[model samples]
Target: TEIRASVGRMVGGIGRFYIQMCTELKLSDQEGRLIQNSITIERMVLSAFDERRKDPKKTGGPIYRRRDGKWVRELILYDKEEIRRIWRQANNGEDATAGLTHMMIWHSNLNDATYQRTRALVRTGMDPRMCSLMQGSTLPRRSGAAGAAIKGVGTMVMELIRMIKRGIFWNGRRTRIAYERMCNILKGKFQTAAQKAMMDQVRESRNPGNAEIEDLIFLARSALILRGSIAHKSCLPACVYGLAVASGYDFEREGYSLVGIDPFRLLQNSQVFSLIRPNENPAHKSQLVWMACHSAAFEDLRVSSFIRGTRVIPRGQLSTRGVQIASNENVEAMDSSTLELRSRYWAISDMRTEIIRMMESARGVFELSDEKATNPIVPSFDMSNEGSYFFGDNAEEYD
Candidate 1:
């Protein structure tokens, strides 16, 4: 019994991380359902519940107990529609009251579809460092700061190279000032101290220590860009759709493609606010949409690059004005390691090129292919073999 209980705790911990990842990434309802239905999660949830029932002395039941003080043994689970409704409320600033607690419970549930889906999406891009942390794998000892810094410089050089290859030029003076402004705007809107700290970490391109901070930073930045989208009205929903795709989340599992949504009256939908608790007052409905975009900006530092992809391509791509440009497909099929390597390699070279141009002539201009800029597409995976997840395999490691 004790052994079973211990395993239950372990499953809960993993479930917690999985659900938080999903919430932070803002996956769609259908995708969330798929995760809930996964066999590994279903088994974990069932075993955990069974162990809880037979424990000679059970604790950690506060949230699960009813007014009569009995365990809420039914393990209430929300469907995709129900979950999506709750999210709509949360995003719109509607106070869910205890509903928020329930929402978190659902997210943390081993069998929750959202939890399952989030786990899968995050695993796809899970950093090797993060994976080690998750698995309790024995990692190599950290090197001294000097050595780490040297490696950092080399990594940065490579990133600059990649950026140059993609036609992204850097003007440090101009770029830094804009970045500072964005940071300032984010700082102004932070609702909590944790959010502020995480923003700092994100600005430095470091891990925010926990998933909460990571989610906060992404949501905050998305909100900033969303406001810009709102100024143009029709662009708001398009921006939301773009963020969904870029994050590689399972939004379509619920059967609603992003292209189907009408942006013109996004906020007026009664269904979105139907689940709002009577005691709460939500911020603008638009705020929820922005918050949902956190996943899109989660890891990639070239967020603005994706946003600009929505713009009209320059005549430079075709030697004259072109109606539509063919986008680069290099990143679409890459595994996580390859993606990381490609991004860093080019960024580093771009920096070197920029330095040479600066030294040679202040007014000198050099150009690279803008193929990447023409279409800002997100990563996609072949999910046919995903059934391998049934056997306790990491989704990314399978086939």
Candidate 2:
């Protein structure tokens, strides 16, 4: 029973993470709900196991598995039809099944239909031993299907496609989800007039637009991103915020700290980054695209503050503990450099009002006032050159 409860909690965590991820990515509005359902299913299944694992002395319990020689962990086995479908999914998703063992689920016991269902579901149409997809028989483990093709992914993809076809995700600039999240975070931190003013500005312009004025809107927006990341992939919200700033979103308000993007490069980024696998882009396509998306997400603020803390971080990709910050850390300590080399994270609850005002003012294209732009840091660029080359028209120049 205790193990079942732990499994329930584990599945709950996984489900929450899934929903949060889908919401952040704005994959499908329905997908968020689906994640809720997934968590429910996981809990129910885990609950069933909990009942089975209950103490026989206290409550009547079904015999499932035991570590002793007489009993063993149960094995769930799938039927043939489900197998065929699973094989197709891996091929569709480009899953890599490098390691696999066998086709049948070998186990000491068989109880709990949910476990059996999962095992059987995984077995449909793949060979766990050979690690092959596209078979008619079920093989008991996901490996037999060849590829980390989880059936749920296939379902999610289809749902996403349906949502896309329905045009539900393309709601233009009006984002209620983003606004609600910002308000919640602001209430806790921004107590002074300055903080309220900054937060207000961001609240007003939940829609997509280019407006540059204050700093905290970006931070708040980043917080929302942080929440979404943590919700889905079990990431630390602080790390997402860090990545957002490091990549050119300004967290500071008073100073000229702003993220800089080549307008041309950023525009190109919008198109290509929309694709799933950004890393495959040749010639820094993915990087630029990601930057553009970051830029567009909060067009109402300075790009410098965001870039000041740039960490060369990619979304959904977590690094070693040294490179990341956990959410469990104190907010005050987050900004402390003594604990970490990075500057304290930019806090904007106080600036919420001002930030929202800025968002509203910059909704139109005419709001983009700055035409001058600067390139981001790249090791290839040399700032150390003296002006000695142009003395007698013998200066070095590019073609």
Candidate 3:
């Protein structure tokens, strides 16, 4: 348990560093970065769980935490001390007992379809797996005991025999088989698990790739793969915790270690709220939308001041509140009022576009697209469809 905790902490730290870097980088930061660290770890861990869900021969467990507090039991009977010994041996290149990374590397690399699916997705551009890793299939189910033996010695041999008869490879791992049959399955399994994990987190978070979370994930992955080459391990975990804060991910309800290092702090430090009162007399008559926005802002401050008490309120705290709405029950104050609020953080990229969108639903003040800038609004163009496209598409048609 301590080992697991240590590793978990280490992973968290790496994620935290990544989040911090993203925060530093203008590309993306804060709300999304703070949340994304946990998202990335979650995707990775959940992928690990899905890979090991069944097929005790290759993997095992209830890796996902359940409300019941059940813990995962390692199939092999070895204690931490013994496992550590083996890990050292493995690291030193000697006969060793199977351990976490060892198990992960083996499970992920094995030609089994579960792990393969994930591997394929992650390795998409690199190599295609030879077999299908899609869920729900007609492949014959093999018993757990049947897979317990070493890859070539037992059920694997029989599986190859069956494959040969069906015109597939006679040898499962043989490179001559064209990796897709084997590699693609593994890759697919890997990527599929990742997507599932991400989607599941989205279910909890309502938003998966917030700028903070995205930044954290990139940084965390780099940290783990590089193993402390960039920043110290201690620095990494905070990012994950920060992400947990910004994105509403899984974390202990207990108070976090970083003191004022919270989003609340970062936001207060931003330039948005410096001259709190709106520009004196008349800043272009303060449009109705802007007036509504100010009212919403006052309400937010009221809530924050109530909760924060003597503590300084962070300006960026409210950016990600509405991301994950629950299934059936809905709270309008948490959702609706938030949408009506004017953003206080000008440091956030693209303040004008969002402000325009908020104030006027962005009607005639700005052109929908370059070609449409001078063109009169027309009912013939499919604005709805055009809006659905991603940011860089050649979208609107000229009048």
Top-TM-score structure, candidate number: 3
What TM-score quantifies how close candidate 1 is to the native fold?
0.18
TM-score of each: 0.18, 0.18, 0.19
Error of 2 at 114 (Å): 26
Global lDDT of model 1: 0.26
The list of candidate 3 runs beyond 4 A from truth reads 27-29, 33-166, 171-399
lDDT of 2: 0.25
Model 3 lowest lDDT segment of ten: 227-236
Tell me the tens digit of each residue's lDDT in model 3 across 1-399: 454444433333333433443443321332233222222322233233333233322311111111233211111222334323332332344332122222332222211211122233233211121122122111224212212211211122123223333442325445334322322222222222332233233233322224323322332232222212110011122233444444543223322222122222322232111001122211211211222111111112333222223211222221122121223422222211111212222110233233233344423211223222344332222223212101121211111
Model 1, span 88-184: residue lDDT tens: 3323443222222222222222111111122422443332222111110111122222112212211221222222334323375565554444444
Query: What lDDT does each candidate get?
Result: 0.26, 0.25, 0.25
Candidate 1 vs candidate 2: the lDDT winner is 1
**Cα lDDT for residue 373, candidate 1:** 29
